[PDB]
């Protein structure tokens, strides 16, 4: 659905979400971004759903850039079971997202179509989003 | 108010030098109106006639542009009209008062008429242009 082709390890620890984004925080490809305003795990099913809506909107139209990738496995014990007996089974995958991450990006489109498309996607995401342009995001010399 | 720059040079440079104009009053034109007097009405005076009320709305300030002192008598109105800053016109004076008599119902009334240093008043253009 959207997952690595291999992993070194099959299951991995949950961990935490310190602030910031580290990187992936400025535009770089297309001409309009959808940015994160809160940390979260975003699931492949959500990414996909949003992405499809984007296209569906400007049907077969411009270009799309999916900038988060679900590498993290998501475990979950069988239903109704009690505790212990090792870690759970892997159900899906998530992408760790932290405020200021530019998750999507678009090119070859009107601002009207874009503005809208993204909004739509922001709905499919379980976090708050903002739209962006191409400011002083040009880390050059 | 950025728009006054391409305008405050042409109601004392255009509205100041001419030769032969007069006043009509196209008023309540219903569905019979689009923008065809800025798209075919030049046939009255060659490269000349048009459709505008430019400086025909603050005409107390346009009756101070070609120097005309004492300003309160006519000037404003739905002054549709058409003459030109370099164009001829004379023989339509008998045909004139036929568009307010019965071809319309009243609406071809006038107000001024600058006959090259000869402005005609109301009945002074209605008796003159006859």
């Amino acid at each position: 659905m959207l997952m690595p082709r291999r992993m070194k390890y099959r299951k991995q620890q949950r961990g935490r979400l310190k602030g910031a984004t580290k990187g992936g925080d400025y535009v770089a490809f297309g001409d309009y971004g959808l940015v994160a305003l809160e940390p979260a795990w975003i699931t492949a099913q959500q990414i996909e759903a949003a992405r499809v809506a984007m296209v569906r909107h400007f049907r077969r139209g411009g270009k799309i850039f999916i900038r988060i990738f679900p590498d993290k496995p998501y475990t979950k014990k069988p239903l109704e079971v009690r505790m212990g007996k090792g870690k759970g089974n892997v159900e899906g995958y998530v992408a760790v997202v932290k405020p200021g991450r530019v998750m999507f990006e678009v090119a070859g489109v009107t601002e009207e179509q874009a503005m809208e498309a993204l909004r739509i996607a922001g709905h499919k995401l379980p976090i708050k989003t903002k739209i962006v342009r191409r400011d002083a995001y040009d880390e050059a010399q | 108010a950025a728009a006054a720059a391409a305008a405050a040079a042409a109601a004392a440079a255009a509205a100041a030098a001419a030769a032969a104009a007069a006043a009509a009053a196209a008023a309540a034109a219903a569905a019979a109106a689009a923008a065809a007097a800025a798209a075919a009405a030049a046939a009255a005076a060659a490269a000349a006639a048009a459709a505008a009320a430019a400086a025909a709305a603050a005409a107390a300030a346009a009756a101070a542009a070609a120097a005309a002192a004492a300003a309160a008598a006519a000037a404003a109105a739905a002054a549709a009209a058409a003459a030109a800053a370099a164009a001829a016109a004379a023989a339509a004076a008998a045909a004139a008062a036929a568009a307010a008599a019965a071809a319309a119902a009243a609406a071809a009334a006038a107000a001024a008429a600058a006959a090259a240093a000869a402005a005609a008043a109301a009945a002074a253009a209605a008796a003159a242009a006859a």
């Binding site: 602030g19 910031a20 984004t21 925080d25 490809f29 940015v35 305003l37 984007m54 296209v55 077969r60 139209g61 411009g62 270009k63 799309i64 932290k98 405020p99 200021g100 090119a107 070859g108 489109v109 962006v132 400011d135 002083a136 040009d138 880390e139 050059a140 010399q141 | -």
Partner: protein, 176 residues
């Protein structure tokens, strides 16, 4: 392109930021100084000048230094500039980016495809007294198949290609 700069002594950057100022520094082989500028005025400028065009900084001693930007650090959250790096030029040849003119539109239209400005600008060696405004491209027959990369450019006097030069610059690619 001019900006009133000021001289920063040792006032906590935080407080300057808090007060709508933008902390920063200026440097070159010879000078190194803590400065600050005002935000909204800098942005007004940078929004156009950016790193492509010179800015002249007006210090509190009346002097007016010709500078380029080398860095805009920003707070990921509240995506705003935290701090500006200014490089004051002189005469020795200095490297920088120069903007391009994507003329017209590419011919890849039937398959839904869309242009990719992979390089809006290119790295070049130039003297501070021979800085160009722009560079002129030639896009027209850029179809869904082929692209262009290297020194396929109209290099004027004062310029030296400081790239590969074999490197992709703009490619038309399929739709989403």
């Amino acid at each position: 392109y001019r900006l009133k700069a000021y001289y920063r002594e040792g006032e906590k950057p935080s407080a300057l930021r808090r007060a709508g100022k933008l902390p920063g520094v200026m440097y070159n082989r010879h000078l190194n100084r803590k400065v600050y500028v005002d935000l909204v005025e800098f942005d007004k400028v940078f929004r156009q000048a950016s790193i492509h065009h010179v800015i002249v900084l007006e210090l509190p001693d009346g002097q007016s230094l010709p500078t380029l930007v080398r860095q805009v650090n920003l707070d990921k959250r509240r995506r705003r500039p935290e701090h500006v790096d200014f490089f004051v030029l002189s005469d020795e040849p200095v490297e920088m980016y120069v903007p391009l003119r994507f003329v017209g539109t590419p011919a890849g239209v039937r398959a839904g495809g869309v242009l990719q400005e992979i390089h809006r600008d290119i790295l070049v060696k130039v003297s501070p007294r021979n800085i160009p405004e722009f560079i002129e491209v030639d896009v027209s027959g850029l179809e869904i198949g082929d692209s262009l990369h290297a020194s396929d450019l109209k290099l004027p006097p004062g310029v030296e290609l400081a790239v590969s030069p074999e490197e992709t610059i703009a490619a038309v690619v399929p739709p989403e």
